[PDB]
Every structure is written in C-alpha cells, then in structure tokens.
Design a protein around this ligand. Structure first.
Ligand SMILES: Nc1ccc(Nc2ccccc2)cc1
Ligand SMILES: [Cl-]
Ligand SMILES: [Cl-]
Ligand SMILES: [Cl-]
Ligand SMILES: [Cl-]
Ligand SMILES: [Mg+2]
Length: 348
C-alpha cells in the first residue's frame, strides 16, 4: 500500500514526500541534488532526504542514478552509510521522474575533529581501525571507494565512524590547484597513469592517518606536479623493480627526467608517534601499489591489538556489477531504476 504524500516548496524547490517525514529544513545542494534534514516518525531517527537533480537527463546521468541506488541498497555494515528508504511520488513507470534517497543524518566529519580536538594515540587507533573494518567489507564486494578523505568520514560524540560519499565517477577543474579533493589520491591515478584498483583506497587511509597524528595535511600540493614531487620526496623515486612494471609511456618519460631520491626515515618525519603507527604507515604509503598492505592484513597489525576481533570483522554478500559494461537507452536505465525503487525492503 502506497503512503500518502504531501507537497511543499523549500528554497524554490518542490518536495513531495510521505507523511512520515516531518519538519523538513534545507541543509545544502550540490550538483547532484538538494538535501533537507527531517524527522522520521516511523523510526524516530533524524534523517537526511536527498532529491536527485535531473536524474535521467542523459544516458550518462541515468546510468549514474542506477549506479548510486544499486550501491546504497547493497551496503549493510556498521562502518558504512546505509539506505533507510528510497521513494518516488510517481504511481507508474510512465509518470516516473523524481527519485528521493533517505539516510541517517550525519553531524561532524573527521575534518572537524582534526582541526578542533586533541587526539590521543588511542583515538587514532580506534578511528583508523573503523575505517579499515569498513574497507575490508567494501573491498570484499569488489567495490573501490575512490574518494576517501576526511570530509567523507562521519564521526559522532562516541568516536564512532561511518564511510560516506562513494565515488560515482569529479571533473578536471575540481581537481586543479591547491585543493583537498586531490590531496588524498594515490600517485598512479593522479594523472591516470594506471587503471583504478582497490589499493588506491589504502593510499588514502595512509594520508588520513598521517594527518590525525600530526594535525597537518601530508601532501598539500599546489597542483598535480607539485604534489607528485612532495610524494616522491617522502617515499622515494621508482626503483628498478617498479620501473619494469610501469605500462604508461607518459609516466615513464616524465619520471625519467627527475633526479633520483631515496625513501626518507619515517621516524624522523612523524616525531613522537607510536613506533607501531610508524610501521603501519610505512606499509600503506608504498609507491608500488602491488606491495601495499591490504585492509584485511592491516586489521591484524599489532597497532590495533586492543580492538581487533577476527570474529567481528564481517565481509559482504557478492555484488553483481555486470551492468557497468552494458549499453542501454535512457528509458532502459530508467526502468531498471524504477524496479529497484519499488523492490526496496527497509532494514529492521
Ligand atoms: N603502469 C604504472 C605502474 C605504476 C605507476 N606508478 C607511478 C609511476 C610514476 C610515479 C609514481 C607512481 C604508474 C603506472
Ligand atoms: Cl507516511
Ligand atoms: Cl516522479
Ligand atoms: Cl576533506
Ligand atoms: Cl548483486
Ligand atoms: Mg563528500
């Protein structure tokens, strides 16, 4: 049975939502939609309600809408954002135009915490442990997050953490200059010299952990090339083993122009840090992505001895991504999205 919907205009936008959602108040609007905070009378939760902007305006946009809904419906883990509800006011596929997504309302992010709070080593242990616990789950479904950074990590008053804002495939201008959008990205993808794989997310975790330990951005480059130079000064220029593996002619020709540099001593960079934290950073921030520690391996590192429990670090159900190689028309992506809206089953 379909709920009753009511309409209201908020900051020049029409919102048509089920009666269960009350006290709507605008909180932001990006290029993908607008967001209101609300009170959900069915669950008692404060929620974020996002109305997608132009979800089916082109093939690229229609596929992106389907991609986002499929991802959010799959994620069921304590350290990853999940979907509380999805709805449309349409009564049939023929009148289907608008999609609304509902999640738990998040307060502070990790940006707020590192700028404002004095963190003990125990705080860093617990925060990084939770990132890695969620990432083990994500990676076990063969998903790559692609955009891990402090503003995409929600944290509450009890220091409990959730991963947000999966990369749905950011423009070139958004990555240009002195911008946090690029400071956490792995070197092999910053100029697209290699195809994305899950090891890029571990590089991001290393950059985040360093910033929690020092209070400062690790690689705050003023552009792509300045940032690469900061990276290679810390971790060294590519050695013979890694050079043999480089398959990008653009990478090779530029890298060969730089004077060679050795890896620095991390104990002299991260002065005063727990030696076990330094050891883990050395295993994450490895230039050769084949040699980086994985999320599952990192959970067993001695730095996390007080939190690690191998019986409480779950993996995901399998996730079918075959749609990503499929070529369909706008109305076919739209019909697939409609089916996923109507089949949604809420959590307990
Ligand atoms: N194919 C391939 C392999 C490794 C890399 N990584 C890299 C290259 C130059 C500088 C820093 C990192 C790129 C392409
Ligand atoms: Cl309702
Ligand atoms: Cl609609
Ligand atoms: Cl950020
Ligand atoms: Cl699936
Ligand atoms: Mg974000």
């Amino acid at each position: 049975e379909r709920p009753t919907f009511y309409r209201q205009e908020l900051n020049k936008t029409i919102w048509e939502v089920p009666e269960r959602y009350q006290n709507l108040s605008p909180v932001g609007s990006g290029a993908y939609g607008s967001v209101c905070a609300a009170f959900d009378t069915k669950t008692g939760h404060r929620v974020a309600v996002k109305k997608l902007s132009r979800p089916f305006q082109s093939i690229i946009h229609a596929k992106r809408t389907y991609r986002e809904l499929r991802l959010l419906k799959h994620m069921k883990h304590e350290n990853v954002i999940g979907l509380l509800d999805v709805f449309t006011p349409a009564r049939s596929l023929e009148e289907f135009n608008d999609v609304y997504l509902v999640t738990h309302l998040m307060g502070a992010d990790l940006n707020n915490i590192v700028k404002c709070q004095k963190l003990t080593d125990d705080h860093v242990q617990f925060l990084i442990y939770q990132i890695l616990r969620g990432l083990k789950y994500i990676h076990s479904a063969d998903i790559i997050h692609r955009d891990l950074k402090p503003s995409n990590l929600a944290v509450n008053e009890d220091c409990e953490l959730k991963i947000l804002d999966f990369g749905l495939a950011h423009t070139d201008d958004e990555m240009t200059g002195y911008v946090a959008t690029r400071w956490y990205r792995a070197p092999e993808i910053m100029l697209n010299w290699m195809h994305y794989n899950q090891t890029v997310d571990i590089w991001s975790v290393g950059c985040i952990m360093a910033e929690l330990l020092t209070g400062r951005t690790l690689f705050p480059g003023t552009d792509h090339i300045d940032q690469l130079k900061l990276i290679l000064r810390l971790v060294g220029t590519p050695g013979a083993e890694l050079l043999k593996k480089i398959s990008s002619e653009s990478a090779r020709n530029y890298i060969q122009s730089l004077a060679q540099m050795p890896k620095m001593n991390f104990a002299n960079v991260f002065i005063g840090a727990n030696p076990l934290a330094v050891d883990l950073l050395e295993k994450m921030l490895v230039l050769d992505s084949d040699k980086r520690i994985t999320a599952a391996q990192a959970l067993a590192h001695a730095y996390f001895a007080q939190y690690h429990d191998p019986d409480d670090e779950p993996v995901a159900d399998p996730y079918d991504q075959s749609f990503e190689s499929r070529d369909l028309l706008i109305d076919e992506w739209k019909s697939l999205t409609y089916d996923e809206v109507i089949s949604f089953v809420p959590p307990p």
